[PDB]
Design a protein around this nucleic acid. Structure first.
Lengths: 22, 420, 326, 442
RNA sequence: UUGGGCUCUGUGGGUGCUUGGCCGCUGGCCAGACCUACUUCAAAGCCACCGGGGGUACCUACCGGUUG
């Protein structure tokens, strides 16, 4: 049935490391 | 877009790119290992934008300003015509053993008189915030041999209670000093009123009109000076079965009879005669009438609205300023006609303020709907099927028009907050 | 279609851009050859009609607009893009007027609940939905038709829904910001609605500024009050004008006072406002005196109400007369 | 102490206090949540439901006043020395303390908050900022800001680094100033002044996913976004009411979710510790609001015994997920939806403990000789008028014992909108319970 | 109790006792990175599941031979 949100999944998303702020 | 502040520590600083494994992939050539701090932070900027490209908000109007305003989102009135902030409140704990005869609200304080054909009157204070019995019982008075049909508060200040039933006599209880008067003679009309059934007290608390047990072609009734309890006048109209209902105007000088077949007659005291006659439109027989309002025709009592409930079950509502032609339209036109209940309407009542009109029939389960003035339509969101009204018998607005009291024929009165 | 597969690749925009022609067989054939799983989630209402080829009616589309906000969202976005690219056209905007009007009509026609904070919060959510499109159409300066349609939707928003005075004046303010002269008289009708359903008695500033900018004020106002009951608007006007200490509003004040438009109560309270303005002021007073002697020597019931208002304030017309004449 | 019973654990608790959580992404498949009991800290999984991965041992002797969790270690500051309590900071790893942080002896201040980056950790006490080299876990310097006024010298709000700025900290005064200091030299390099100075204090501050822009939340009300080297204001927002200041803010880095099309980014969630509601803005054109989430927890009130608030917000790494920990022992993780547009998220994960103390306490008898057994399920009747079945075995498999679609009942009514409230709708509090599973067939 | 019901679908939890997401792990990573080296010596046998009675020209296998 329409209007339905699917099974929630983990998306892959790259992040910035702040550990290089030294 | 010049940078405001500057540092010298970044030019002092340098970092080993090829040594740094995390920072290894940020070079431009395979020759850049030792890189100054300013160029290093620049490569950091390149890495960060490659990670996430720049957004468009990173690249007034009145309602746009209202829109960004969050104070725009924060969590009795006069009331709008299609719904009501209505809230059923606590119920009266004491019941009646018989059907409910009438309700009456005290004009100053929230005091409620409930009255049953079990010959019994109860007085209560409105207190939802009471403990451990909300809406406490002031009194339970019982009158012997005398099933109460109807009672009235006498006084705009509300000091006395008169009550009258199937007996030929009625009583006045002065609350101050608590005294009782048994009136039993209307000065030559003791064959003429075999009951004391119907009666109305003026809004000024001055005149009491009692209907007559002599129908025979036309209703008649007697006006009484209340403080003296005396016959002062009589009005008689020509109909078919006598008096259906009747009410004073907003002044307390003239009044209205509706008798069966829907004939309504206005009658003033200063002339001591009938102002005139007109027909409730097409009503084959009336059963209930009521009169209310402000800013109407002052010569007809300044009240705005007349409510007519007919034994078919249709509710005819009119404006007395439109009743004018001191001449009278013999065939007035309906301001608003109401076909929203099947059987004959049992009781109808005006709000004090002149906004709300409650009406109900008693043969059906819970025949009660509610009307906004002057739009003259129903409130389409109350009451539900599972709103526990009962086979309704009595309806009273509060004095301040915040409280609704209703009573079925079982002995269970219930209460509502009218929030506007 | 037969080259670029537009029916498959751009279903939403094509579907919206032929949507306002919902009784023609070209639209019927488009509905015939769409792919069903490609129709947008907003747009999946035609499924009974694609099972049974027949042109769906406006009642169906708008009922989906009521209990499906997102259809309205998408069609709003298309038509505002049309007016932003200046390619608006009368069939489009007339369709969109009917759509928004019956849509938000139905939206309030459910959103009235009776529960207090529920109706407030529902009006909040409604405002969040209608916000961007209604602002863009209120100040869409190049397109007078969509200005009229925005006038329509916010007018119904005012007159039906029991909205709060600040939100109402904010509508007034953006309309003030955005009208033109071809849209002038209808926008005046909107302000009659807006102030007529306002609860407070005063207007907030720039509205009064632009109504001074209005060319034919009392003539247009008599023409509209021939059918529209403009009294609260005139009252808020004269309140704002006596609040302003500028002296270039006085011919407007005099004309509206003689206009026979405000109530006797409004007229007497405006006269007391003007004399308390004359009392607080510190030439200026000469202009106030010429205006006040014109109003006291007004002829009809306006002058009679002014004189009886002088009688009930119990201040000497002769004192101020000789004080300004000496 | 005692001779029989040794203290083992305090349960019924995920986040009751005022300290916010801290959240790290593990890999590309899980997110660690870290929350303080008040005498310990737990770390939850996100993908694997909301079960408890790490429990912090040993107990701090005092109430924790700060924390943050790095790639492996849990840094927790405890102790308000202003009233007796000894203070300290400890370094845990996997629930067990590996190290301890050397405090300066001259610290008569409770230690407010913690930040870690580069090779340095910085810790803000009340008006005072101490620094340790993290690569050595050694005291490096102590930052002392100065103001002319005893009030204005207070370090309220907090501090942050920008992602692209080398060794620069951004702190909020009790005045409306934000101070930039280089931590390498320990020098105040710059300060920025509040526009329309009627706003009093920086109540919060947060870097945006764009470069070199700080959002500042003012106790006087304005939310501003500014260039932080140009000192160039990007936008003002009148969102904080005067006595109702905002608590904190976050932006959506998931890349889409604004402009009502689903085709736009830049959304702000904000929240106020005066309410239980949160707020959602599309930042692109006018920084418009679009959506109120009404009563995401119980709002705090002093007339009532109910305890709650909103201690934090967070958008996690690039996904529809947002955590809110309140003070109502309360976490509910929310989720943006894709296939329609929606104003609000709906809930997708939850853990709850009460908003009031526990009145009555009872155990369950054994599945008569089995495993459900003696020591598994304990029923707790809380003065928040509720009944909870707590799991001694795995605290996640505890649950509420609901009374129905009560939250939806409130939402149809106005208990969530603006009368009584939700505890007054649920049945009254609990005198005494008894159980018997001699028929309880599941 | 200012509408409610059946019926279906979607999400999360739990339906067992609460110790990380990944890797070339006494270590590293999550923005990764490095990418092709080094080399002394093939293996011990056995087992190994097809429905029954029946035929064996040819093939396979076993055994015992034969030229080279």
């Amino acid at each position: 049935p329409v209007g339905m949100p699917a099974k929630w999944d983990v998306k892959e998303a790259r992040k910035y490391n702040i550990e290089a702020d030294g | 877009d010049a940078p405001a502040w500057e540092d010298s520590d970044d030019e002092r600083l340098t970092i080993s790119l090829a040594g740094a494994t995390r920072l290894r992939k940020l070079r431009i050539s395979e020759s850049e290992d030792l890189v100054s701090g300013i160029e290093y932070a620049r490569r950091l900027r390149q890495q960060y934008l490659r990670l996430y490209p720049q957004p468009d908000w990173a690249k007034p109007l009145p309602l746009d300003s209202f829109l960004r305003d969050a104070n725009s989102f924060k969590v009795r009135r006069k009331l709008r015509p299609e719904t009501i902030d209505i809230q059923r409140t606590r119920d009266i704990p004491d019941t009646h053993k018989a059907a409910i005869s009438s309700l009456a609200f005290h004009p100053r304080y929230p005091i409620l008189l409930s009255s049953s054909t079990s010959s019994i009157m109860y007085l209560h204070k409105l207190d939802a915030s009471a403990y451990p019995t909300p809406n406490p019982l002031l009194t339970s008075v019982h009158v012997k041999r005398t099933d109460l049909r109807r009672a009235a508060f006498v006084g705009p200040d509300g000091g006395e209670i008169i009550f009258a039933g199937r007996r030929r006599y009625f009583h006045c209880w002065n609350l101050s000093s608590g005294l009782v008067k048994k009136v039993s003679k209307i000065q030559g009309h003791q064959k003429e009123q075999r009951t004391m059934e119907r009666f109305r007290v003026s809004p000024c608390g001055r005149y009491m009109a009692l209907v007559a047990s002599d129908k025979k072609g036309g209703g008649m009734l007697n006006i009484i000076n209340v403080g003296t309890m005396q016959w002062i006048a009589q009005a008689r109209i020509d109909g078919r079965h006598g008096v259906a209902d009747f009410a004073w105007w907003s002044d307390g000088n003239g009044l209205t009879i509706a008798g069966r077949d829907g004939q309504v007659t206005e009658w003033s005291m200063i002339t001591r005669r009938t102002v005139g006659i007109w027909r409730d439109e097409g009503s084959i027989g009336g059963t209930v009438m009521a009169l209310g309002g402000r800013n109407g025709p002052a010569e007809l009592g300044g009240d705005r609205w007349v409510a007519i409930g007919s034994n078919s079950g249709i509710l005819n509502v009119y404006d007395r300023n439109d009743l004018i032609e001191i001449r009278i339209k013999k065939y007035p036109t309906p301001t608003r006609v109401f076909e929203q209940l099947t059987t004959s309407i049992s009781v109808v009542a005006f709000s004090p303020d002149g906004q709300l009109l409650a009406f109900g029939s008693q043969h059906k389960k819970d025949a009660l709907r509610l009307v906004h003035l002057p739009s003259c339509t129903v409130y389409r969101n109350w009451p539900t099927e599972q709103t526990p009204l009962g086979r309704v018998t009595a309806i009273a607005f509060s004095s301040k028009s915040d409280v609704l009291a209703v009573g079925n024929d079982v002995g269970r009165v219930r209460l509502w907050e009218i929030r506007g | 279609i037969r080259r670029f597969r537009i029916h498959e690749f751009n279903t939403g925009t094509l579907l919206a851009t032929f949507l306002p022609y919902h009784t023609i067989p070209a639209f019927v054939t488009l509905l015939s050859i769409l792919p069903v799983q490609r129709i947008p989630i907003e747009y999946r209402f035609l499924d009974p009609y694609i099972k049974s080829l027949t042109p769906p009616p406006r009642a169906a589309i708008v009922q989906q607009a009521t209990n499906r906000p997102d259809l309205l969202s998408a069609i709003s976005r298309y038509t505002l893009d049309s007016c932003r690219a200046k390619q608006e056209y009368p069939g489009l905007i007339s369709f969109w007027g009917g759509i928004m009007a019956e849509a938000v009509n139905g939206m309030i026609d459910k959103m009235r609940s009776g529960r207090r904070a529920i109706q407030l919060e529902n009006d909040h959510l409604l405002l969040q939905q209608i916000g961007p499109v209604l602002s863009e159409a209120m100040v869409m300066k190049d397109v007078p038709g969509i200005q009229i349609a925005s006038y329509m939707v916010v007018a119904i928003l005012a007159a039906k829904g029991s909205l709060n005075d600040n939100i109402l004046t904010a509508f007034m303010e953006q309309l003030v910001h955005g009208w033109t002269v071809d849209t002038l008289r209808p926008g005046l009708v909107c302000l009659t609605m807006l102030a007529q359903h306002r609860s407070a008695k005063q207007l907030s500033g720039r509205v009064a500024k632009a109504v001074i900018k209005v060319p034919d004020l009392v003539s247009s106002l008599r023409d509209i009050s021939k059918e529209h009951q403009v009294d609260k608007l005139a009252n808020g006007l004269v309140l704002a004008f006596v609040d302003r200490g500028d002296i270039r509003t006085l011919p407007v004040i005099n004309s509206l006072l003689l206009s026979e438009l405000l109530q006797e109560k409004q007229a007497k309270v405006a006269y007391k406002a003007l004399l308390l303005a004359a009392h607080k002021i510190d030439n200026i007073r000469k202009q106030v005196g010429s205006a006040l002697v014109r109003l006291s020597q007004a002829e009809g019931d306006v002058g009679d109400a002014i004189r009886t208002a002088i009688q009930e304030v119990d201040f000497n017309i002769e004192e101020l007369e000789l004080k300004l004449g000496a | 102490g005692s001779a029989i019973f040794a203290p083992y654990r305090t349960i019924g608790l995920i986040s009751p206090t005022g300290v916010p959580f801290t959240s790290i992404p593990l890999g590309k498949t899980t997110f660690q949540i870290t929350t303080s009991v008040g005498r310990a800290l737990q770390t939850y999984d996100l993908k694997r439901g909301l079960n408890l991965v790490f429990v912090t041992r040993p107990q701090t002797p005092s109430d924790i006043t700060a924390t943050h969790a790095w790639k492996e270690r849990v840094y927790a500051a405890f102790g308000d020395p202003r009233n007796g309590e000894p203070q300290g900071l400890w370094v845990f790893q996997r629930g067990k303390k590996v190290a301890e942080l050397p405090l300066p002896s001259d610290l008569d201040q409770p230690i407010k908050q913690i930040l870690i980056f580069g090779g340095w950790i910085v810790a803000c006490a009340l008006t005072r900022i101490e620094v340790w080299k993290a690569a050595t876990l050694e005291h490096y310097t102590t930052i002392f800001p100065a103001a002319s006024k005893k009030g204005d010298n207070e370090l309220t709000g907090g501090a942050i680094n920008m992602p692209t700025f080398l060794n620069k900290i951004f702190v909020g005064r009790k005045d409306g100033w934000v101070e930039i200091w280089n931590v390498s030299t320990g020098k105040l390099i710059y300060t920025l002044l509040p526009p329309s100075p009627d706003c009093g204090a920086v109540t919060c501050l947060q870097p945006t996913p764009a470069l070199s822009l700080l959002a500042i939340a003012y106790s006087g009300g304005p939310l501003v976004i500014q260039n932080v080297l140009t000192d160039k204001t990007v936008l003002l927002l009148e969102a904080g009411t005067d006595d109702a200041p905002v608590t904190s803010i976050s932006f959506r880095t998931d890349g889409l979710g604004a402009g009502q099309d689903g085709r736009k980014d830049g959304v702000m969630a904000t929240a106020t510790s005066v309410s239980g509601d949160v707020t959602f803005w599309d930042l692109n054109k006018g920084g418009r609001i679009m959506g109120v989430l009404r009563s995401a927890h119980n709002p705090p009130s002093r007339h009532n015994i109910v305890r709650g608030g909103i201690s934090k917000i967070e958008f996690l790494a690039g996904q529809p997920v947002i955590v809110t920990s309140g003070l109502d022992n309360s976490l509910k993780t929310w989720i943006f939806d894709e296939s329609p547009f929606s104003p609000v998220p709906r809930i997708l994960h939850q853990r709850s403990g009460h908003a009031a103390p526990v009145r009555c306490l009872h155990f369950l008898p054994s599945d008569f000789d089995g495993a459900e057994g003696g020591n598994k399920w304990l029923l707790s009747g809380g003065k928040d008028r509720s009944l909870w079945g707590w799991s001694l075995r795995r605290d996640g498999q505890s649950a509420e014992l609901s009374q129905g679609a009560i939250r939806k009942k409130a939402r149809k009514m106005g208990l969530l909108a603006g009368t009584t409230t939700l505890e007054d709708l649920k049945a009254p509090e609990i005198t005494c319970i008894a159980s018997s599973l001699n028929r309880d067939g599941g």
